[PDB]
């Protein structure tokens, strides 16, 4: 019933360096949303890396099981069509694909190309905007079938309202039944999350709910 657990986790990127994560604690039940916030260098991406097994803890316990889909904070494209970039070697299903591109507002973009979903990216032709590349990268991660979705600041280059709309249509509605960790700073995302973890220089600045944090004000 619990999907991801960290208990008293401390970790280092360099032996004898300073810890990148210090005494971190959280729990996510199946289907819940954890928001992970904090300033640059706080350890948010490192926390995701530990879940993906690229960073081993020096102290503490970690629990998680199953396939992971990871959306990097650095959007990327490979040579191929926009459809191929989103499916990215996963089996194709029209309904699933269309649901994702609609939730990511990409249907609007794609409808304007004569080649539609067969427009070729990453081969010197179309030069995508930063917001387009971010929404394609998010769609790629969301299309993949996984037990756990790790979305590392996926709303790069998007204006406030577009970010809000895609957070609601993709992360909250399309992915409503999925276990999600979303690295984000935005107030509405923290308010909608089941739990919030705010990191500061590796430490747990706050862990709880948005309501609990409100109760602390005053
Ligand atoms: C991800 C990563 C971080 N680090 C170091 C860099 C930092 O000193 C520290 C924490 O880095 P990050 O985990 O990358 O911090 P962040 O993701 O919260 O920052 P941002 O909002 O800008 O994305 O770990 C490594 O040494 N190797 C790595 O692969
Ligand atoms: Mg990061």
From Swiss-Prot:
N-glycosylated. Changing residue 23 to Y: In CBAVD; uncertain significance. Changing residue 190 to S: In CF; impaired maturation of glycan chains. Changing residue 119 to T: Enhances trafficking from the endoplasmic reticulum to the cell membrane. Residues 17-218 form the ABC transporter domain. A lipid is attached at residue 104 (S-palmitoyl cysteine). It comes from the Eukaryota. Changing residue 44 to M: Impaired maturation of glycan chains indicating impaired trafficking from the endoplasmic reticulum to the cell membrane. Changing residue 200 to P: In CF; impaired maturation of glycan chains. Changing residue 181 to F: In CF; impaired maturation of glycan chains. Coiled coil: none annotated. The modification Phosphoserine is found at residue 129. Changing residue 131 to D: In CF; decrease in the frequency of channel opening in vitro; decrease in channel activity and ATPase activity; complete loss of bicarbonate transport; no effect on trafficking to the cell membrane, protein stability, nor on the maturation of glycans. ATP 1 binds at residues 13, 38-45, 73. It is found in: Apical cell membrane; Early endosome membrane; Cell membrane; Recycling endosome membrane. Changing residue 129 to I: In CF; impaired maturation of glycan chains. Monomer; does not require oligomerization for channel activity. May form oligomers in the membrane. Interacts with SLC26A3, SLC26A6 and SHANK2. Interacts with NHERF1 and MYO6. Interacts (via C-terminus) with GOPC (via PDZ domain); this promotes CFTR internalization and thereby decreases channel activity. Interacts with SLC4A7 through NHERF1. Found in a complex with MYO5B and RAB11A. Interacts with ANO1. Interacts with SLC26A8. Interacts with AHCYL1; the interaction increases CFTR activity. Interacts with CSE1L. Binds and hydrolyzes ATP via the two cytoplasmic ABC transporter nucleotide-binding domains. The two ATP-binding domains interact with each other, forming a head-to-tail dimer. Normal ATPase activity requires interaction between the two domains. The first ABC transporter nucleotide-binding domain has no ATPase activity by itself. The PDZ-binding motif mediates interactions with GOPC and with the SLC4A7, NHERF1/EBP50 complex. Epithelial ion channel that plays an important role in the regulation of epithelial ion and water transport and fluid homeostasis. Mediates the transport of chloride ions across the cell membrane. Possesses an intrinsic ATPase activity and utilizes ATP to gate its channel; the passive flow of anions through the channel is gated by cycles of ATP binding and hydrolysis by the ATP-binding domains. The ion channel is also permeable to HCO(3)(-); selectivity depends on the extracellular chloride concentration. In vitro, mediates ATP-dependent glutathione flux. It is linked to Cystic fibrosis: A common generalized disorder of the exocrine glands which impairs clearance of secretions in a variety of organs. It is characterized by the triad of chronic bronchopulmonary disease (with recurrent respiratory infections), pancreatic insufficiency (which leads to malabsorption and growth retardation) and elevated sweat electrolytes. It is the most common genetic disease in Caucasians, with a prevalence of about 1 in 2'000 live births. Inheritance is autosomal recessive. Belongs to the ABC transporter superfamily. ABCC family. CFTR transporter (TC 3.A.1.202) subfamily. This is Cystic fibrosis transmembrane conductance regulator. It comes from Homo sapiens. The gene is CFTR.
């Amino acid at each position: 019933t619990t999907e991801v657990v960290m208990e008293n986790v401390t970790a280092f990127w360099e032996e004898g360096g300073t810890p990148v994560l210090k005494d971190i604690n959280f729990k996510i039940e199946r289907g819940q949303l954890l928001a992970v916030a904090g300033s640059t260098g706080a350890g948010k991406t490192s926390l995701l890396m530990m879940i993906m097994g690229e960073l081993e803890p020096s102290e503490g316990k970690i629990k998680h099981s199953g396939r992971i889909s990871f959306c990097s904070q650095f959007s990327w494209i490979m040579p191929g069509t926009i459809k191929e970039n989103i499916i990215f070697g996963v089996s194709y299903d029209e309904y699933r694909y269309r649901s994702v591109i609609k939730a990511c507002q990409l249907e609007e973009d794609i409808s304007k190309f004569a080649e539609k979903d067969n427009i070729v990216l990453g081969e010197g032709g179309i030069t995508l905007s930063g917001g387009q590349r971010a929404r394609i990268s998010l769609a790629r991660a969301v299309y993949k079938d996984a037990d756990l979705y790790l979305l590392d600041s996926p709303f790069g280059y998007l204006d406030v309202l577009t970010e809000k709309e895609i957070f609601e249509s993709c992360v909250c509605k399309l992915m409503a039944n999925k276990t999600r960790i979303l690295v984000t700073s935005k107030m509405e995302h923290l308010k909608k999350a089941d739990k919030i973890l705010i990191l500061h220089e590796g430490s747990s600045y706050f862990y709880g709910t948005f309501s609990e944090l409100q109760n602390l004000q005053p």
